[PDB]
Amino acid sequence: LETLAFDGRTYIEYLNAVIESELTNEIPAEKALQSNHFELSLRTEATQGLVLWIGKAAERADYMALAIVDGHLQLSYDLGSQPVVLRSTVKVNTNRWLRIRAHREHREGSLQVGNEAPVTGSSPLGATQLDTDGALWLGGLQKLPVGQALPKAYGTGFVGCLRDVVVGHRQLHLLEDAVTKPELRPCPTP
C-alpha cells in the first residue's frame, strides 16, 4: 500500500467524502455527522501526540479527536454537550505497528487498539451530532487548537508512521486525497 510519515510539523488535511451531484443528481450539502468510523495503522516511539482531528473550524467546540496521552491512546469528542474521553490501555510505543478501530454512533463511541477489549462509553446526552466543515486532519494540527481546554498533548505534532487509512467504508488514498500537501514521505524503515 503506502505509508505517510510525520515529523511532528506535518499536518495533512483531507476532505470528508463529498456528494457528487454530477453523478447522483442529489442536492449538494454538508450536514453535521451522524456517525464516524476510522481504521488506521500506527507505528511510533512517541509518548504524547495529537494524531487525528475531525473538527469544526468554529471556535466553540464540536470535535472528534484521537490522540496519544502518556504512551496510551485517547478518543475524545465534544458533540455540543460536554466531551467524552476513551483511553486505550495499550501502549503506543514499541515502534511496532498497531491497528486502530475508532467508531462512534451518535453519543456512543468505541476505541480498540491492537487486540485489547474495546473501550466503550457515551458523550453526554443532548447533542448527538458533530458539526463539520469538511475537514479531516492528520499528524496532529498546524497548532490550530480551537481555544478549548484540551490536554497539552493535543497541541503537539505527531511523530511516527501511518498506513491503511479507512474513513467510514472508503479506503483513503494517502497522497491523492490530501488537499494540503506540505511534504510527503513513505514511512522510514526503522
Binding site: N25, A29, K31
Partner: protein, 338 residues
C-alpha cells in the same frame, strides 16, 4: 407567432394584464419589468434579464435551494438543506423568520399558493409532500404514498392543481388536487432526472427539465401534446421558469442562468455565469401570480384548520397529529388516547 391565442379564422389575442406588441403577435405584460429570483446556495439573488443589473437579496445563507414568493404580501420563501429549515422574509431581505423547523431531510422544492395563502413543499429525503399556512401552522402531510424522490413542484390555484416531479427509481411527473385527491400521472415515460418544472398560465401549458435526457419538454396541462423544445445545451439543468415568450433555467454544469424561446428553443442566451451553485429560479412579476377566486371565500371558509381546493370546490383537512371530526372540524388525537 401568437404568444397566447388566435381567435377568428387570424388575429392574435392578449390575456388580461397583457398587451399585444408592435408585432401584433407577441404579448407583453403590463406592470414593472420582469425580475429573475434565484437561489445560489449561499445567497438569494435578483437579475434583470438582457441587462447587467445584478442584486444580492439575502446573504449569509447556509444552503439555499428551493424558493418561491408571495407578491402582494411582499414575501419570499426558501428552503435550506444543510439546516433542514424552511424560512420566509419580506421581499426586501428583512424580517427573516423560521417557518418549518422540524421533520425535514432534503426539502428540495417550494411552491406558494398566493390565492389561498398556502405553502406546499417536497422532501426527497422524507418522501413526502407537505402543506401549511404562510407562517407554517396547520402543518399537514398531503402526500406520502408512492413518492420516492419528489423535487420540483408547481401550483395552479385557479385550477386547484398540484404538479411535481419525482426523479426516484420510478421517475414520474404527477398532478393532483390541492387537497391531495384526484392524483394522476402526467408522464412516467422517457424520464430519469426530472429536476425542474414550471407552469405557463397564460399559454395554458407546462414545461419541465430532465437533467439526464438533456431536454426541456412542453406539455399540454393534462400531459398530452408532449413535445421536446430544447434538445441541446442541457448538460445539467436544475430549475426552470416561464415568462412571456421566454424560458429561464439554471444549470449545475455551466453554473449559469440560461434563456431560450418557448415555442422554438432558439435565441439561447446566457444571462449570468460564474454563479456559485445555481439552484431554484423564478420570474418576479405580478402577472406570474395572477388573481383567482378563493374557494374558501369568506375566511370562515377556512373551516376549523385547513381548507384545501379539491375537484371543483374544496375540502377541509387536519394538520399532523389531528383527527377529522364531522368533516368540518379537526381535533388532536391526544384527547382521544387517555
Amino acid at each position: 407567432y401568437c404568444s397566447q391565442g388566435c381567435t377568428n379564422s387570424f388575429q392574435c389575442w392578449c390575456e388580461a394584464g397583457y398587451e399585444l406588441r408592435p408585432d401584433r403577435r407577441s404579448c407583453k405584460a403590463l406592470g414593472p419589468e420582469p425580475v429573475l429570483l434565484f437561489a445560489n446556495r449561499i445567497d438569494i439573488r435578483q437579475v434583470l434579464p438582457h441587462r447587467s443589473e445584478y442584486t444580492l437579496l439575502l446573504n449569509n445563507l447556509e444552503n439555499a435551494i428551493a424558493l418561491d414568493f408571495h407578491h402582494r404580501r411582499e414575501l419570499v420563501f426558501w428552503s435550506d438543506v444543510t439546516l433542514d429549515r424552511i424560512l420566509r422574509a419580506n421581499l426586501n431581505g428583512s424580517n427573516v423568520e423560521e417557518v418549518v423547523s422540524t421533520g425535514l431531510e432534503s426539502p428540495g422544492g417550494l411552491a406558494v399558493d398566493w390565492v389561498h395563502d398556502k405553502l406546499y413543499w417536497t422532501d426527497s429525503g422524507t418522501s413526502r409532500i407537505e402543506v401549511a399556512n404562510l407562517d407554517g401552522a396547520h402543518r399537514k402531510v398531503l402526500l406520502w404514498q408512492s413518492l420516492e424522490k419528489p423535487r420540483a413542484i408547481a401550483l395552479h390555484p385557479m385550477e386547484g392543481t398540484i404538479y411535481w416531479t419525482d426523479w426516484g427509481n420510478t421517475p414520474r411527473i404527477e398532478a393532483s388536487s390541492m387537497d391531495g385527491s384526484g392524483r394522476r400521472i402526467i408522464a412516467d415515460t422517457h424520464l430519469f432526472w426530472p429536476n425542474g418544472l414550471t407552469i405557463d398560465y397564460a399559454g395554458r401549458r407546462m414545461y419541465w427539465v430532465d437533467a439526464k435526457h438533456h431536454v426541456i419538454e412542453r406539455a399540454n396541462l393534462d400531459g398530452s401534446h408532449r413535445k421536446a423544445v430544447i434538445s441541446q445545451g442541457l448538460p445539467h439543468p436544475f430549475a426552470i421558469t416561464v415568462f412571456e415568450d421566454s424560458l429561464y433555467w439554471t444549470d449545475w454544469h455551466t453554473k449559469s442562468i440560461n434563456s431560450a424561446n418557448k415555442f422554438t428553443g432558439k435565441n439561447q442566451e446566457i444571462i449570468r455565469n460564474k454563479l456559485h451553485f445555481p439552484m431554484d429560479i423564478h420570474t418576479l412579476h405580478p402577472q406570474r401570480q395572477p388573481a383567482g377566486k378563493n374557494r374558501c371565500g369568506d375566511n370562515n371558509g377556512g373551516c376549523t384548520h385547513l381548507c384545501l381546493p379539491s375537484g371543483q370546490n374544496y375540502t377541509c383537512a387536519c394538520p399532523t397529529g389531528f383527527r377529522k371530526i364531522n368533516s368540518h372540524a379537526c381535533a388532536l388525537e391526544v384527547l382521544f388516547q387517555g
